[PDB]
C-alpha cells in the first residue's frame, strides 16, 4: 500500500552500511589507527 517496505526493489541503506563499515576498519585512518595515533601522542606528551 502506502506505508510498507518488504521488497528491496530500491534500497540504499546497504551502501550506507558498507561505507560506514569500510570507514570503520580502514587500515590507514580507521578506528584502530586513530587509537594508535592517540597512543603515540600520549607517549610523546608523557615520555
Amino acid at each position: 500500500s502506502q506505508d510498507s517496505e518488504d521488497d528491496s526493489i530500491r534500497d540504499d541503506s546497504n551502501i550506507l552500511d558498507i561505507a560506514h563499515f569500510v570507514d570503520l576498519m580502514d587500515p590507514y585512518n580507521g578506528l584502530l589507527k586513530k587509537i594508535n595515533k592517540i597512543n603515540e601522542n600520549l607517549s610523546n606528551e608523557l615520555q
Binding site: 576498519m25 580502514d26 584502530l32 587509537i35 595515533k37 597512543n39 600520549l42 606528551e45 608523557l46
Partner: protein, 59 residues
C-alpha cells in the same frame, strides 16, 4: 588496501585479529592514560593531553 597493508594477506584473519588488536589497544591506552594522570596531574600537561586526545579522536 588490507592486502597491500598486510603482506601476509590471510584477509579473513584480519578481522578476528582486528578485534583482538582493538582490545589490546584500548587496554594499552588505558595504561598510558593512567600513567600520564599519575605521573604529572598538572594544569598545562592535562589540558594538552585532553586537547590532543580530542583532536585525534574527533578528527
Amino acid at each position: 588496501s588490507i592486502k597491500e597493508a598486510s603482506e601476509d594477506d590471510d584477509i579473513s584473519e584480519y578481522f578476528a585479529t582486528y578485534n583482538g588488536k582493538l582490545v589490546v589497544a584500548l587496554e594499552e591506552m588505558k595504561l598510558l592514560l593512567e600513567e600520564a594522570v599519575k605521573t604529572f596531574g598538572n594544569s598545562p600537561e592535562k589540558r594538552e593531553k585532553i586537547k590532543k586526545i580530542l583532536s585525534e579522536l574527533k578528527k
